[PDB]
Amino acid sequence: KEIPDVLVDPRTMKRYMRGRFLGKGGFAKCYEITDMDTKEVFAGKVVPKSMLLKPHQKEKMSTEIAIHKSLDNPHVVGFHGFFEDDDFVYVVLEICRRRSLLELHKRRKAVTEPEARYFMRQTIQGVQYLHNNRVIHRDLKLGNLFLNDDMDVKIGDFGLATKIHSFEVDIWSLGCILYTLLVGKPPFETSCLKETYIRIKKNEYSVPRHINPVASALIRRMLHADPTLRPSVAELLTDEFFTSGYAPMRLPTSCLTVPPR
Ligand SMILES: C[C@H](Nc1cc2c(-c3cc(Cl)cc(CCCO)c3)noc2cn1)c1ccccc1
């Protein structure tokens, strides 16, 4: 079943031209779409109705949309209306041309401390907005921290997001991201998936000694076994880690491949 070259919706009655392929996720596939009138460029998440043949699965996406729809923040992927024909459900989104922070981590391994400061700040600032509006992401990873042409972090993929474990699980994930960014490998990463779940449950990780004491301290508190002892979102920004060392306000695109100078 072919995805139409042009995508029109009943509501806004605008025409979206399906352009270059961008990636995929599970059953969903993403293409760069262009508004044929305004020429504005968007990322079109295309989901086939055949994957949502079961009404239960058709709820998971309508929840995701209802949460993403309500959102407006310079650090969360912009929502720009959704729609459907008989075959596909189309979600029009903000275009992040520099892929995700995962691609960066893969290409870069362990990034520099100022880079982690910049990347974390912007991510935490987005997570704050979410938490303030009573939204928990629940599925935060480097692949969900997208990047645009100005290297701005934009949180996406609200597939497991909920509205009110609680807010403290998102602090946990952020502790993992900070770990991975500074260390260069995920803290509970193993070949075997079952082993990872054991590592998480037993709280088995170890920050190498090569990492900054102040940085390792923050990580540890973020990854604390007692969810009530993990820091709050507001408490993260003000941590010594962000305020003591050098923190750039901008990052070059070169950061996708090599450390900045
Ligand atoms: C370059 C492009 N840009 C881009 C991609 C998106 C997506 C998206 C949708 C789906 Cl079904 C799958 C993926 C792949 C990643 C696996 O999760 C992303 N939604 O919104 C966007 C805004 N921009 C981009 C490509 C790969 C990773 C990341 C960003």
Contacts of 90 (CB under 8 A, 6+ apart): 7, 9, 16, 44, 45, 46, 47, 82, 83, 84
Contact between 161 and 135 under an 8 Å Cβ cutoff? The reply is yes
**Cβ pair 196, 130 in contact under 8 A:** no
Query: Among 115, 110, 176, which residue's Cα sits nearest to residue 141?
Result: 176
Give the CATH number for residue 190.
1.10.510.10
Bind-site residues for ATP: 45
156 CB less than 6 Å from ligand 1?
A: yes
Cα separation, 249 vs 74, in Å, equals 15
Q: Are residues 177 and 61 in the same domain?
A: no
Residues 89 and 24 in one domain: yes
Pair of tokens at residue 69: 């729809």
Q: Which of 18, 21, 22, 97 to mutate to test the pocket of ligand 1 (most atoms within 8 A of CB)?
A: 22
The DSSP annotation for 149-193 comes to TT--EEE---TT-EE---THHHHHHHHHHHHHHHHSS-TT--SSH
Same domain, 261 and 140: yes
What burial class does residue 250 get, using C-beta atoms within 10 Å of its C-beta: 0-12 exposed, 13-18 middle, 19+ buried? exposed
| Catalytic residue (choose from 139, 152, 226, 239) | 139
**Torsion sign across C-alpha atoms 47, 51, 53, 57:** negative
Give the domain range for residue 220.
Answer: 97-261
Q: Indicate if 107 and 29 belong to the same structural domain.
A: no
Q: Which of 96, 117, 133 is the last residue of a domain?
A: 96
Whether the CB of 157 sits within 6 Å of ligand 1: yes
Point out residues after which the chain has a gap (C–N over 2.5 Å).
Answer: 164
Residue 238 parent element (H or E): none
Instruction: List residues forming the annotated binding site.
Output: 22, 26, 45, 94, 96
Q: Are residues 41 and 14 in the same domain?
A: yes
- How many independent structural domains does the chain possess? 2
- Does 171 lie in the same domain as 45? no
